[PDB]
Amino acid sequence: MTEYKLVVVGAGGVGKSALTIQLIQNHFVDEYDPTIEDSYRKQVVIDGETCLLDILDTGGQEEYSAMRDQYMRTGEGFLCVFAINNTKSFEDIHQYREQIKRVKDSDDVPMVLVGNKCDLAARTVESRQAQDLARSYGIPYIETSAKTRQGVEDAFYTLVREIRQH
């Protein structure tokens, strides 16, 4: 079956890790272990088609800036994430998109803009704002609340659809 290599990029502190976890992980088990073999892979059915999602989340390694290009190139599709209560992370979205476009050497790379709700702090990036940015880039925008599980599947599946329809 088809295997999609999804990469999750973005500034640190925006929950990128909660997204990947909230997708993969079994939500009815006390313990979760990342170091465990293939806890990054998951088989899912999308629009009746079964495939394998291989997700690359390098949360915590943001400071290793020189390894960005390597990690990104291994990907077919990208999830550009920013926290809705963190304006700086939002503004960083552009550079990430440019960096992806560069290593992939294409102006048309499958990607989704994801606004993520990490906590209850005041929202600082208004839905419309991201909406408009996502449209200017011509890519879908999905808002999520990784902790309440809302939007996570949509975010990932939407991207897979992008890859397929590329």
């Binding site: 502190g13 909660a18 006390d30 170091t35 915590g60 290793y64 390597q70």
Partner: protein, 448 residues
């Protein structure tokens, strides 16, 4: 059967129940429990488990304050007697010794708790000072000397002798001529391995537990980890600069080769960090696209660089396997750890509830302890390589980006790439040489 004090005069006597302690399905492994139940096992009388002490003292702060920990271990120490010689031998003694073990460790390896809170130290000193008994006397005096020692303010023995420092074009004391090609690739790798090995060894658990290096005061709480990652990033960037700033194809090919040799010596030294610094450079946007340059790289080297690159493939599958097999000393790649620690903390609940009773989720803390413990294990063994002050100084002061912001510099390098090897169909221009010395490598076999 041994009788315990009355759970009314000693809290740590409460029998275990599904409502205050849970075990993982050979001593027991605690999945979850109440702070009391935890500290009870922290100093259990039945068996020994120093791993639990390190684990607990490394992660307790997330579920119990320092001041409270003290108040609790103290309560644990003061056990009421209800055979008396049996209870003392099989209960009070082990327990009390173990409480003193926790105090010794706490002060010896997690002293920062006392540095940041003077009243805690005061209470600790006072407590240790009240431990009466000729028996405990041995320890009491020890914990005391350690405390005093810690308030006012490491030799190395080797099996064999360190190899001879290797030189090439640059000669001792001529730091002004030191550069990628004029120094001996063997020493370059050697010196950078020591440097990187020290940087690695200096990272403490407190800079890792709690994903603090990713928070806003990361500069204050994870200075050593950051200092380490930044050296690595610089080194990688330097390699990239060296390559795209050598415009002459023939000289550039010479550079990439040297770098691949350095990588080879890193492999030999088990400095996986260095391995990746190289791989990352070669895979960077600027370098990755220089087809004409890699075209002319001998096949043995292309194979080396490919095997090195495979380590990171499939989520470091091969990297992890190789570290688990090699024989230390080695410099691991820290990145892997940072991700697992962060993910372990985010993908697991701080507590598990059983009948409305929030029990501290200890398996979460144990998992993170396993990671910090793994880090520490590789931190013990020192490399047997003589230091070269001047070369050392040379790499410590490398500053690829100068005063340029990351993005500007980053674009610079990429443009440089487009200049020395234009996108097709544009034609490949020729450029003047820049090195006035021989570009032949001295090879990576140590002279003996």
């Amino acid at each position: 059967q041994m009788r315990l004090p009355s759970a009314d005069v000693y809290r740590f006597a409460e029998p275990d129940s599904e409502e205050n302690i849970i075990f993982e399905e050979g001593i027991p492994i605690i999945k979850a429990g109440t702070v009391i139940k935890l500290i009870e096992r922290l100093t259990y009388h039945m068996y020994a488990d120093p791993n639990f002490v390190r684990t607990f003292l490394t992660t307790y702060r997330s579920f119990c304050k320092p001041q409270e920990l003290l108040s609790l271990i103290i309560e644990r120490f003061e056990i009421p007697e209800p055979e008396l010689k049996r209870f003392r031998k099989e209960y009070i003694q082990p327990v009390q010794l173990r409480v003193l073990n926790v105090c010794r460790h706490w002060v010896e390896h997690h002293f920062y708790d006392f540095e940041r809170d003077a009243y805690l130290l005061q209470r600790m000193e006072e407590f240790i000072g009240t431990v009466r008994g000729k028996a405990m006397k041995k320890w009491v005096e020890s914990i005391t000397k350690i405390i005093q020692r810690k308030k006012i303010a490491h030799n190395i023995t080797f099996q064999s002798s360190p190899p001879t420092v290797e030189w090439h074009i640059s000669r001792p004391g001529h730091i002004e001529t030191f550069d990628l090609l004029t120094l001996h690739p063997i020493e370059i790798a050697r010196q950078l391995t020591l440097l990187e090995s020290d940087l690695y060894r200096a990272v403490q658990p407190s800079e890792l537990v709690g994903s603090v290096w990713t928070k806003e005061d990361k500069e204050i709480n994870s200075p050593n980890l950051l200092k380490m990652i930044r050296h690595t990033t610089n080194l990688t960037l330097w390699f990239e600069k060296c390559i795209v700033e050598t415009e002459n194809l023939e000289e550039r090919v010479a550079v990439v080769s040297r770098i691949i040799e350095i990588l080879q010596v890193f492999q030999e030294l088990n400095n996986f960090n260095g391995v990746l610094e190289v791989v990352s450079a070669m895979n960077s946007s600027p370098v990755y696209r220089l087809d004409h340059t890699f075209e002319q790289i001998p096949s043995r080297q292309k194979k080396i660089l490919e095997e090195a690159h495979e380590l990171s493939e499939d989520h470091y599958k091969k990297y992890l396997a190789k570290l688990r097999s090699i024989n230390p000393p080695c410099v691991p790649f820290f990145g892997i750890y940072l991700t697992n620690i962060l993910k372990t903390e985010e993908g697991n609940p701080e507590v598990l509830k059983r009948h409305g009773k929030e029990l501290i989720n200890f398996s979460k803390r144990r998992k993170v302890a396993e990671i910090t413990g793994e880090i520490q294990q590789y931190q013990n063994q020192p490399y047997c390589l003589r230091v070269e002050s001047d070369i050392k100084r040379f790499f410590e002061n490398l500053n690829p980006m100068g005063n340029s912001m990351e993005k500007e510099f980053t674009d610079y390098l990429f443009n440089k790439s487009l200049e020395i090897e234009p996108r097709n169909p544009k034609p490949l221009p020729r450029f003047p040489k820049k090195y006035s010395y021989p570009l032949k490598s001295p090879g990576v076999r140590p002279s003996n």
